[PDB]
Design a protein around this ligand. Structure first.
Ligand SMILES: Nc1ncnc2c1ncn2[C@@H]1O[C@H](COP(=O)(O)OP(=O)(O)O)[C@@H](O)[C@H]1O
Ligand SMILES: Nc1ncnc2c1ncn2[C@@H]1O[C@H](COP(=O)(O)OP(=O)(O)O)[C@@H](O)[C@H]1O
Ligand SMILES: Nc1ncnc2c1ncn2[C@@H]1O[C@H](COP(=O)(O)OP(=O)(O)O)[C@@H](O)[C@H]1O
Ligand SMILES: [Mg+2]
Ligand SMILES: [Mg+2]
Ligand SMILES: [Mg+2]
Lengths: 371, 373, 371
């Protein structure tokens, strides 16, 4: 019987059936609590709104996310998101369908255990599995080698894989990701006097970032041009029709990935981090981890971000070997697609976790089937 | 109506007009002014054969006002003479007019928002300590508009006799902090009209005279659409001049005062009040709201209360909002304004405290009504 | 020669010669224009009053404040205030004296640039500088490290400082301050049957805020006890001789700082804001910030505010840390006294934007030289 594939990203939840080509539902991972008293009859209010129902009504709802930096921090919301996933979006009874879940690497073991418990102990799934988000991207891109670069809303992580074998010691993770680029944009827009504040507005700052920002190929040159030519200024129309003009901000935001000092943290940028991961791998495999540098996740959608990576890694790597970023069109859903492959394959069925084993061994089983 | 056969009544308790009817009626059955008064001998009047009670109340006190020293028990939404207030309800429910005459049938009350708390509580006392009512509820005056209009999101503009209110409601949520008051209402426009006619040499000064200039106001006044066009048409041509007959038959004539008086709603500085006109106080309220909700308030402005009846007021109000949005949101990008979808609900029925949604849709029989306790 | 220190905050302007121990002049930043036609030809000349005249004549004047939320909003009125400041209040002409202005963080840069342009073009000052208001407050304490909390009339903001290094990423700000606390008082007095509505009367509601309001040490106990007896029912006189008397309104306004949801804003209160900023600081700094919360600005003058804030942070912070709150007696002037110290400092005498530098670079020089 068909399995469900679900990518429980911070940011946007993606879910669908195994063997489909693209996720059947995508919706924001937000639970909204009304901040004002209802007074009318016939209103149809309830204790919370979730997903698109919440996003479309945020002028009343104190939106909060359940997942912070890839860790589930409020199970009483996350259970409501999963409930919304099965019964409202996919409209499926979960006890019939086994499910493939996702996690980032270097995620605390308590999270994975509670997650697997909630699945068997409340939704009564037949079976499930937890796959590392990075690993699935090589399934999607159809290959068995590469350093995966994956960056969601809440985590950036890098996983070198070769000949189908992972190298755990060379895994690198950074918490700088799509949400911190949204707060940064929300900060720097105060310079032009747009005082975006509170959670219902942060979703608007995201919509600007998701449409106007781009990555500079040469930061200081773009700064000098922005300081002298209006060509880079663009305008966006707010929900009430107030137009705003944005410029210098447009690229100074995603530049943060390459200069994390902008958000105040001293970790090296993603280019140095990816290079570090390669240089930590075994010598022989480096020559083709410089090829197959597979990007993934929505924070890699910025125009030019593939090229800025190639330029900087080429500036770090020896010149006698060639850099080649792999950047699919579908990369926003590459993680889910990789799960849609993996869950459909043969030779995976005997390596689900099954409810019989779960009740026998408890949630500590996850460390003995999953990676 | 109730499954027990009980009837249910709405009283608007209006500062100027009590308005009464049974639940589910599309009309009030009785509209009458809140005057209460005592007989007074006056030299200027022949004393009739018509019997004057030692306290006339309601509609009778309005027609026989020529013999009467009249009070309003309600001022600016606060009861200022509690004894006449009791006597006004004792008349409303008595054998005359809305003869329920009983404790058993329920009453709905409507209170203005931002109402001094003791005013609310004394009503809830006397309703249970004097009439001993079986069922009472106090409703948010603003929401009753949207129930009658059949809406859940919109900004209610509610210019009565006593005070003007603006209250947004968004998908049924009360947003209280976006409440505003403007202290311009039908009573102040009347006193201002008295002064404007005083310049034209007609003296009005008795309490009985206040009702007469109100009847002038209701029939001749209107709000200027383009105030420059009204001023030019007054200056260039005579057509604005129109006659009226006072009770004694003096054929008085009134002119540009027909529009100079109502204009005070948009220009409080013509009266002593320092502030902004109804349109700009409405605009600042929407602009204070959280950014995504504004898109709907512009499409669901809703008008209530008799002082909104002035000919052209919806048209004048829409103009000032479009111009405010052009000046301060589109920043003068004139041609973009074709995109500004704005709409005013101005239904010709606008004694807009009708009861259908508030009673029968809320209870045929339920634990919602407060009850003897 | 001597520098001028000029705290053009919203609310009360403060100016005086550097090195002096307290301001020479303080007056309200209000411009008063007549609301009735000027008709007593003779003495009734002035078309726009400023400062103490406007505050006094307020009965006939439509007062307005040209700084809103720390952002200058009418530059022609602001110029009149500075003109009043130099020629009438200090009685020292600007052409000979360099000026230390001071500003809140995250203001739009256009504010800083035009403020400088006015200074060089109109008042023709020798040189000037634009310090951030928070670090000035830290100087006044004689303090090398602390977390500054300025609560002005129009802006409240936290800036954490360690060893004199600032932490820009941990700067955070809230647009709730002594004005909106007054506007809220101007509502809740209507619950009791008063009414204040004109702009002049808003000056009377401010006055009662200063004299009678206090922060509750236990708000829910205070509410329950206020319902028990008239023991709180303090009394105060209007200028007309009407007498007003007040109960639980005394603390409900101050409490707005700790529960912004009273005025319907979604942000956390000043206590949770302070702790949130410390949690952004680098971990080994945190212990030393807890010992050096320094309060500043008039809104922190309410009785019991230091104790209430200590209680809240002591509960919220780890129980082994020794939370203490530095509330100087003179903290209302802390920003100006801090400027007086900086403008005396032998090192600072290099830091001015000197006239020729503006003559070279134009207004943008402020972003080079100033913090
Ligand atoms: N077109 C775009 N340009 C820039 N950033 C984007 C774009 N689309 C999405 N993003 C950002 O990428 C983030 C990716 O999150 P998501 O893909 O849901 O993470 P996950 O891999 O855990 O599913 C989004 O939350 C958003 O912040
Ligand atoms: N057709 C009309 N044109 C202008 N004013 C009117 C009209 N009808 C009523 N009014 C005025 O409206 C006021 C009464 O409105 P109402 O809604 O009954 O107030 P309330 O309900 O607060 O007593 C009075 O000033 C009355 O003169
Ligand atoms: N006890 C008090 N004495 C003086 N001012 C007070 C007091 N309590 C509150 N305040 C308020 O503090 C504000 C003045 O702060 P201000 O000095 O203008 O700060 P800034 O100048 O940094 O804006 C005014 O709103 C004043 O009413
Ligand atoms: Mg994902
Ligand atoms: Mg009314
Ligand atoms: Mg200050």
């Amino acid at each position: 019987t068909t399995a469900l594939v679900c990518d429980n990203g911070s940011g946007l939840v993606k879910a669908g059936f195994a063997g489909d080509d693209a996720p059947r539902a995508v919706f924001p991972s937000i639970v909204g609590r009304p901040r004002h008293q209802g007074v009318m009859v016939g209103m149809g209010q309830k204790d919370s709104y979730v997903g698109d129902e919440a996003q479309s009504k945020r002028g009343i709802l104190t939106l909060k996310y359940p997942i912070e930096h890839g860790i589930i921090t409020n199970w009483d919301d996350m259970e409501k998101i999963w409930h919304h996933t099965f019964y409202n979006e996919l409209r499926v009874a979960p006890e019939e369908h086994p499910t493939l879940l996702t996690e980032a690497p270097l995620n605390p073991k308590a999270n994975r255990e509670k997650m697997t418990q909630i699945m068997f102990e409340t939704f009564n799934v037949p079976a499930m599995y937890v796959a590392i988000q990075a690993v699935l991207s090589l399934y999607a891109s159809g290959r068995t080698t590469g350093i995966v670069l994956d960056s969601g809303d809440g985590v950036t992580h890098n996983v070198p894989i070769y000949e189908g074998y992972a190298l755990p010691h060379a895994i690198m993770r950074l918490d700088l990701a799509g949400r911190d680029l949204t707060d940064y944009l929300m900060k720097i827009l105060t310079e032009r006097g747009y005082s975006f504040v509170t959670t219902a507005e942060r979703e608007i700052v995201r919509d600007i970032k998701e449409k106007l920002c781009y990555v500079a190929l040469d930061f200081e040159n773009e700064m000098a041009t922005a300081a002298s030519s209006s060509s880079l200024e663009k305008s966006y129309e707010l929900p009430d029709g107030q137009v705003i003009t944005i410029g210098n901000e447009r690229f100074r935001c995603p530049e943060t990935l390459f200069q994390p000092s902008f958000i105040g943290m001293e970790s090296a940028g993603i280019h140095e981090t990816t290079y570090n991961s390669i240089m930590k791998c075994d010598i022989d495999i480096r020559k083709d981890l410089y090829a197959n540098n597979v990007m993934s996740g929505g924070t890699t959608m910025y125009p030019g971000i593939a090229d800025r990576m190639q330029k900087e890694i080429t500036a770090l790597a020896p010149s006698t070997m060639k850099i080649k970023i792999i950047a699919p069109p579908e990369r926003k859903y590459s993680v889910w697609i990789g799960g849609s492959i993996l869950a459909s394959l043969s030779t995976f069925q005997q390596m689900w976790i099954t409810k019989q084993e779960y009740d026998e061994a408890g949630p500590s089983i996850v460390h003995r089937k999953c990676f | 109506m109730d499954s027990q056969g009980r009837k249910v009544v709405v009283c608007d308790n209006g500062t100027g007009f009590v308005k009464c009817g049974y639940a589910g009626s599309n009309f009030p059955e009785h509209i009458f002014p809140a005057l209460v008064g005592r007989p007074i001998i006056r030299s200027t009047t022949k004393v009739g054969n018509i019997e004057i009670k030692d306290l006339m109340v309601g509609d009778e006190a309005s027609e026989l006002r020529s013999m009467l020293e009249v009070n309003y028990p309600m001022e600016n939404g606060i009861v200022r003479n509690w004894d006449d207030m009791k006597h006004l309800w004792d008349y409303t429910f008595g054998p005359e007019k809305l003869n329920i005459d009983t404790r058993n049938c329920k009453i709905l009350l409507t209170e203005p928002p931002m109402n001094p708390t003791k005013n609310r509580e004394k009503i809830v006392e006397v309703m249970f300590e004097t009439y001993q009512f079986s069922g009472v509820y106090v409703a948010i005056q603003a929401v009753l508009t949207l129930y009658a209009q059949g809406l859940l999101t919109g900004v209610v503009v509610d210019s009565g006799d006593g005070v003007t209110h603006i209250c947004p409601v968004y998908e049924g949520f009360s947003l209280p902090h976006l409440t505003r008051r403007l202290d311009i209402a039908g009573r102040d426009i009347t006193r201002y009209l008295i002064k404007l006619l005083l310049l034209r040499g007609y003296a009005f000064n008795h309490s009985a005279d206040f009702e007469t200039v109100r009847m002038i106001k209701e029939k001749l006044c209107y709000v200027g659409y383009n105030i420059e066009q009204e001023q030019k048409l007054a200056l260039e041509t005579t057509v604005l001049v129109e006659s009226y007959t006072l009770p004694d038959g003096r054929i008085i004539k009134v002119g540009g005062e027909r529009f100079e008086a109502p204009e005070a709603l948009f220009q409080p500085h013509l009266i002593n009040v320092e502030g902004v006109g109804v349109a700009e106080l409405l605009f600042n309220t929407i602009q204070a709201a959280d950014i995504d909700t504004r898109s709907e308030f512009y499409k669901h402005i809703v008008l209530s209360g008799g002082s909104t009846m002035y000919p052209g007021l919806p048209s004048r109000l829409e103009r000032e909002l479009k111009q405010l949005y052009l000046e301060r949101v589109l920043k003068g990008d004139v041609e973009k304004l074709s995109k500004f979808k704005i709409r005013i609900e101005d239904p010709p029925r606008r004694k807009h405290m009708v009861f259908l949604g508030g009673a029968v849709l809320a209870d045929i029989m339920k634990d919602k009504d407060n009850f003897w306790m």
